[PDB]
Amino acid sequence: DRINTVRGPITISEAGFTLTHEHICGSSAGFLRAWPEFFGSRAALVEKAVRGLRRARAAGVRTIVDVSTFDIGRDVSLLAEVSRAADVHIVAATGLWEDPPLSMRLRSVEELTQFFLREIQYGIEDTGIRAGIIKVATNGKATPFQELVLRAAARASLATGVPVTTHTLASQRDGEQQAAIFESEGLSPSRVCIGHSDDTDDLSYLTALAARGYLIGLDGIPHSAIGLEDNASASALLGNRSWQTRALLIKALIDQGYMKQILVSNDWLFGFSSYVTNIMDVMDSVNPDGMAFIPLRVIPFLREKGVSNETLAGITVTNPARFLSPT
Amino acid sequence: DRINTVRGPITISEAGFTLTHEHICGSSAGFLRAWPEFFGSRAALVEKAVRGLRRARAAGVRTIVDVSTFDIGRDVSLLAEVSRAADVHIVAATGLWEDPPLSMRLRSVEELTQFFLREIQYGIEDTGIRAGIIKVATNGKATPFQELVLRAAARASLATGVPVTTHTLASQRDGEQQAAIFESEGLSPSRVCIGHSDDTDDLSYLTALAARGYLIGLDGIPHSAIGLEDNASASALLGNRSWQTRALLIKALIDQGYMKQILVSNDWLFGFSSYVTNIMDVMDSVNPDGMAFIPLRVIPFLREKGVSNETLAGITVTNPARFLSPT
Numbered sequence A, B: 001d002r003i004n005t006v007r008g009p010i011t012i013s014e015a016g017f018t019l020t021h022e023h024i025c026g027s028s029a030g031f032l033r034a035w036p037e038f039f040g041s042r043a044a045l046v047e048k049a050v051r052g053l054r055r056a057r058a059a060g061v062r063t064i065v066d067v068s069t070f071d072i073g074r075d076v077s078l079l080a081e082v083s084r085a086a087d088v089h090i091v092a093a094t095g096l097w098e099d100p101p102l103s104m105r106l107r108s109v110e111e112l113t114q115f116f117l118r119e120i121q122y123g124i125e126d127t128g129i130r131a132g133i134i135k136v137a138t139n140g141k142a143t144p145f146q147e148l149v150l151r152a153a154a155r156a157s158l159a160t161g162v163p164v165t166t167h168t169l170a171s172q173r174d175g176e177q178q179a180a181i182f183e184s185e186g187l188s189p190s191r192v193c194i195g196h197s198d199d200t201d202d203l204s205y206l207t208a209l210a211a212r213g214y215l216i217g218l219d220g221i222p223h224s225a226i227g228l229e230d231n232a233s234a235s236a237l238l239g240n241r242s243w244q245t246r247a248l249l250i251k252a253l254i255d256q257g258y259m260k261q262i263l264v265s266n267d268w269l270f271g272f273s274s275y276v277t278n279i280m281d282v283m284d285s286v287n288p289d290g291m292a293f294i295p296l297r298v299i300p301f302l303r304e305k306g307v308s309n310e311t312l313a314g315i316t317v318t319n320p321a322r323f324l325s326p327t
Ligand SMILES: CCC1(C)CCCCC1
Pocket: A254, A306, A307, A308, A309, A310, A311, A312
């Protein structure tokens, strides 16, 4: 059994400590190729990501799952470059996020299923690099096209065994509808992570997903604008709940019996052009540890609050492997 | 004085008979790279475009202006390939159409001006190919972002001398607002073509633009769903006015004194993924002549209606050169 990474297949044991929702760069299709100066340069972006993934690896990370799709401007050659230089495995994604272009938005369920299966089974672009996860998104009630996306992701997963991970607007409880669509296609909830679930404190929502077998993506732990004076765009993005508040949802779900269904991540990036200018600077001041925030700050916080080392290892190592390994 | 093409600078006399609004492929950024099977294959698309541009060249076309921007999925290497194989000059474009991604839509006027100037002055992507026109779009009242686009296009034109060409929803008279924005930035109307102007019969609108000095883009002459039974998507795209009706607007503006301000084109393509599946098949049944429709069918129609050979040469050769040559 093997997981596809940007440097090829790896064994389950090789994945190790895995961050399940991360990005090298949050962009748009074609954007880094057309406007590399937006990032300084392409080399500057590469160097920043290598440095950050090095720091993460020193803190114990072995693999990240880059959940950048086509419409986040995923550049698998950029991921392979960074992966080789930092010695951190990167799993790439297929699927569609919240910014599909017209050439995607006009497609049928069958067509999209073809595209997702191309990326899982054949390769991304002309690279031969295969995705190891399918990423999808809603922000409230699904648009007609997003329902097609969710159905195509389910079809792709059913044919291949690769899991599905989601973006939600957690305040709208989107995982409810997402689950409904997925289940209508026959997808097992154990193949699905409902992401950005740490953006809500609603335990009735979180446990109702976990009770049916979903994995719960508590994937934005360091996202917080607390004590950012009067920066409306950072507040709108990051929220005003503390990282501790978010991290305590890990403990909460442990305490309810769902330790095997928890997936934790930073949802960090090294470049971010699909938001306001200089947001990466703002984010990096909030969390200078970047992708190392989970091991360096979250794990010790949870140990101080009484969570066991063994439970945290199961969450950071066992759960990601179970989720990623195709089934 | 020179015009930039995808194979480098050419003299004004080399441009010859020029179609001012065309596309090799109407797509989305990254799409042909990620999903070439949508088109059959990349080679099939190339071969179809070469065959079509050959037929056009035999009918007298020497240059086309490919008004595909970043968000139409412009692939300048594809254009150079096709240009070399067909021996037809292709002018490429910068700017933004109606499907900009978030990494564009979040940008300032100053940022966009940087991007358009990159594509005109330095090159597209890492190709060294420079755009020779800036393309912009509204569909009714401009969105806030589209106003920034129009202003940045004006700034880019003011620094470089390259012209601006527009997409409109002609039924909403968008050229009125477009002109207002452009003039507020100090752009000369003689540097601007208001496109898709053949989609309306409103001569008060058309003459009010031409009176202030705009060029008028009568650029979709073969676009018609007349006698396509019950195909709602083709009707919505193409309209139910005949090609003759559209072509008679050429004569109308001649007859009002605006022969030097008329630009004519087919607004054809060889691939079209940003609309419904199989639309290219539908379009190619309506107009099997493709980009040769203007010389093969429009020019003789207008001669039969009393327009002179010399006037039509001025419209197909002189006007494009005047417009494209930087000033
Ligand atoms: C009983 C919950 C537990 C104490 C198990 C070991 C890891 C930490 C959580």
